[PDB]
Design a protein around this ligand. Structure first.
Ligand SMILES: Cc1ncc(COP(=O)(O)O)c(CNN[C@@](C)(Cc2ccc(O)c(O)c2)C(=O)O)c1O
Ligand SMILES: Cc1ncc(COP(=O)(O)O)c(CNN[C@@](C)(Cc2ccc(O)c(O)c2)C(=O)O)c1O
Lengths: 485, 483
């Protein structure tokens, strides 16, 4: 006897085990060290080298999940986790994938699941109006929205949409002259997107940012660089302002960047990946002011909107530009029911809209706003606690729920960077908290970003006390010779 | 106060609701019409225009799933679903993504979750040895395997690394001379991959296939086209032999194609998205014979390996080529940085999906699972051969039959006959199959693969095909299809 792999009753049986296994996880997630403490190669030695010929009980697999898999996790959901940007999830977002995985439809056209395409077009207008985007970006007006996996894939489709738009006008042999623009703080997804699309690696620009502008891109400096490319015979094509960069959570001013990009007929993709979600709150919406002149806008719902990884939201003014670059239909039908596969790189589309649908319904706009707000006040609190300690300084202004700081010693920039390097890694090696760094403007600053869904105010104070405890211990036995190397 | 959106008790309470909800769905899934019967725009009318300002009870949400979302589903998981290619699911694969959604870790480097990277390299060697792949593709030898979301992006990363392999030898100004090769049966993922990767639209070849070899690509025909392109000033770059094409499950001979591709220093990517999973069985492994002389191999483990959607398995012989092409570190610089093997930076715990499926079912049963699918299709093929008014159009290779109803200029007539006949079967909502036009002949595809599909469902589908064959042919007139 061999029970069918999709037995409804065995599905129910084993399914409840995991739901209780994961509920127990979120309950006791505080007890593991946040950053994993295993050595590289630990798993190849604790597991067999071949697949088993006969079945293994789930009660055995779940046990090995506890002893082999779990010690090899860096607990992104731990309430004492602040590294990088949040992997923000929720119950509503979790059950979104569960229904999407249970149904297991492949929405590569409208017929394969009408609801999997039409619902995505509804909730992208829900989230559009919440962000108060102009009618040019959503389906009520003359635009559209698509759900994908990464911003990097979303930036790519946009880049090739802009690229093909230009090369269709002037010719394909000029791909070696197209230039892609971003600041030196723009995330490395823009560079990778350029590399894949056939953009020349010598034609990728990392415009310099200064501390005077808090490391935001200067429309003056950008246009300076463009004139160099035009004088050199290059074709400027694609510029990517960022609202909430990865290192110093810096913000670029889009309204004068579209000014410059309009002059030289460019594409303005605006990349709020992390910080885009906070713009559903009126007090933060000013950060994407000037997005009405850009060609596309990108935010990542798994970073700061409780929809589980992965879920990336792309809005475009001209969804036909993606159709003409990504559809495999002949080039005389792309200019003539939504076929969302022509808006992205993934043909086998997933029922990703169920995640967003359940998050917006199960919490509503009012509570969804306060969630993001609470993460901002918690970091705002952390920023104020830093300020009342004369041993720390704030390196750059806080914009959205992430604080950058540094423990100054009693050029010394080399010395203050080795101090923070040793101070940070000592706090991180305890396993009690986890937070990363960034070298911005030569300074070595520690990044404290609050966003874990299970993070409460008591955890920020716990991290503050641990930062203070090591501050005492590090500076108490201070000696330049220990850090002057 | 305000309940936390990740409360353990609220997680577990609503978590068991959906588990019962889906087990209920898998029980009654046979009652819905397989192909959706809603009209375009049905859901914008039944739903609000704005997101709610106040939370809605999970109980009320699930009622709108049954009454508004389920009518808009084409039941890929129905036991009577034979359209396109299977969406192979299983309990184990479901628990793999739910375990990987509960942790919800981002695997963009080894430290963000070592097990997310380490486990991915064990299961891909488990699989690799299970398909009897050469040691050149495994981590034990001198290769490597990476799990990606789709084939279109797996074919991409190899395409955008084969290009970088050659363009870094001859200079990047020759991108307009690189030719991408495939048959006219090769899936449109190769065209799209070449489109995104900068290959010129004029330089995509869809080499012709003939019925004389069941529409598999001929290395002789491939070589004729290559010399044609060399004398045109072009540079042959990349060939993609397909094992089990989407239209008629044709097989391109891999070994002679690599022979031609080594003459002209080409990249041979084997596409086995559907068929590859069946080479676990030693009696099927001969289809990817010659993969030892290729550069990359890819199968989708959502079509025929019970891992739900999505799970694509790429085995590259030289993982340096991907890294050197997809990493963003300076070119003088390029543990496992798996993100440098694909287009996705924030990578997910796909390994659990493939881990549970291999572990809880075992090698012995997994073969019998695929063997069962093939055998049911091999039985449906035998039923067609007893009804004298049907014709098997092309040889059945894996678990999919291509048949057509014959009538009692003639091709146009018969092609219209099967179109009307097929859509009358599909419109009942009882069963669901799709078609293809291979060699100008309209044929019906019967793809057995749904995990819930038993033998009585195939026999049930045979009866319905016969009741409509009796029906359309009983009142046959040339004029009804001469239009
Ligand atoms: C500002 C910005 N834009 C784009 C991206 C890349 O998009 P993606 O990798 O999702 O496709 C980033 C990347 N940010 N990634 C982090 C900050 C780490 C990270 C944290 C939480 C997540 O949910 C993800 O996916 C990544 C990194 O350091 O690389 C970005 O910041
Ligand atoms: C032989 C072959 N190679 C590649 C692809 C593209 O892979 P992906 O789209 O997964 O990146 C295909 C596509 N096949 N897709 C179907 C058969 C529809 C389909 C059926 C069942 C599924 O689980 C998926 O994902 C798609 C099509 O007809 O296009 C392919 O056949």
């Amino acid at each position: 006897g061999v029970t069918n792999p999709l037995d409804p009753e065995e599905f129910r049986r084993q399914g409840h085990m995991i739901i209780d296994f994961l509920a127990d996880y979120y309950r006791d997630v505080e007890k593991y060290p946040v950053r994993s403490q295993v050595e590289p190669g630990y798993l190849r030695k604790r597991l067999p080298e071949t697949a088993p010929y006969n079945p293994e009980s789930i009660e055995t697999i779940l046990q090995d999940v506890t002893t082999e898999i779990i010690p090899g996790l860096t607990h992104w959901q731990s309430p004492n986790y602040y590294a990088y940007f949040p992997s923000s999830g929720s119950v509503a977002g979790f059950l979104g994938e569960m229904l999407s995985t249970g149904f297991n439809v492949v929405g590569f056209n409208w017929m394969s699941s009408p609801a999997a395409t039409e619902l995505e077009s509804v909730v992208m207008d829900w989230f559009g109006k919440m962000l108060n985007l102009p009618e040019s970006f959503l389906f009520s007006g003359s635009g559209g929205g698509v759900l994908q996996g990464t911003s990097c894939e979303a930036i790519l489709c946009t880049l090739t949409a802009a690229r093909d738009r230009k090369l269709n006008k002037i010719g394909r042999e000029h791909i070696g002259r197209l230039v892609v623009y971003g600041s030196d703080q723009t995330h490395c997804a823009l560079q990778k997107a350029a590399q894949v699309a056939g953009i020349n690696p010598k034609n990728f620009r990392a415009i310099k940012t200064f501390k005077e502008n808090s490391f935001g891109l200067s429309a003056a400096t950008l246009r300076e660089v463009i004139l160099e490319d035009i004088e050199a015979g290059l074709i400027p094509l694609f510029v990517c302002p960022t609202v909430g960069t990865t290192s110093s959570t810096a913000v670029d001013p889009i309204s004068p960047i579209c000014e410059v990009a309009k002059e030289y007929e460019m594409w303005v993709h605006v990349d709020a990946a992390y910080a885009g979600s906070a713009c559903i709150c009126p007090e933060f919406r000013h950060f994407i002011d000037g997005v009405e002149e850009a060609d596309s806008f990108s935010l990542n719902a798994h970073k700061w909107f409780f929809t589980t990884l992965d879920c990336c939201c792309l809005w475009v003014k001209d969804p036909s530009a993606l159709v003409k670059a990504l559809s495999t239909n002949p080039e005389y039908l792309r200019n003539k029911v939504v076929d969302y596969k022509d808006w992205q790189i993934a043909l086998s589309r997933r029922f990703r809209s169920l995640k967003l649908w359940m998050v917006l319904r199960s919490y509503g706009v009012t509570n969804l706003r306060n969630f993001l707000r609470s993460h901002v006040k918690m970091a705002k609190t952390f920023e104020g606690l830093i300020c009342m300690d004369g041993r720390f300084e704030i390196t750059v202004p806080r914009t959205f729920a992430m604080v950058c700081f540094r423990l100054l010693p009693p050029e010394n920039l080399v010395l203050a960077n080795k101090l923070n390097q040793v101070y940070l890694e000592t706090v991180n090696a305890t396993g009690s908290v986890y937070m990363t760094h960034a070298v911005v403007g030569g300074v070595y600053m520690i990044r404290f970003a609050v966003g874990s869904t299970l993070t409460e105010e008591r955890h920020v104070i716990y991290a503050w006390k641990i930062l203070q405890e090591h501050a005492d211990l590090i500076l108490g036995k201070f000696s330049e010779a220990d850090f002057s190397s």
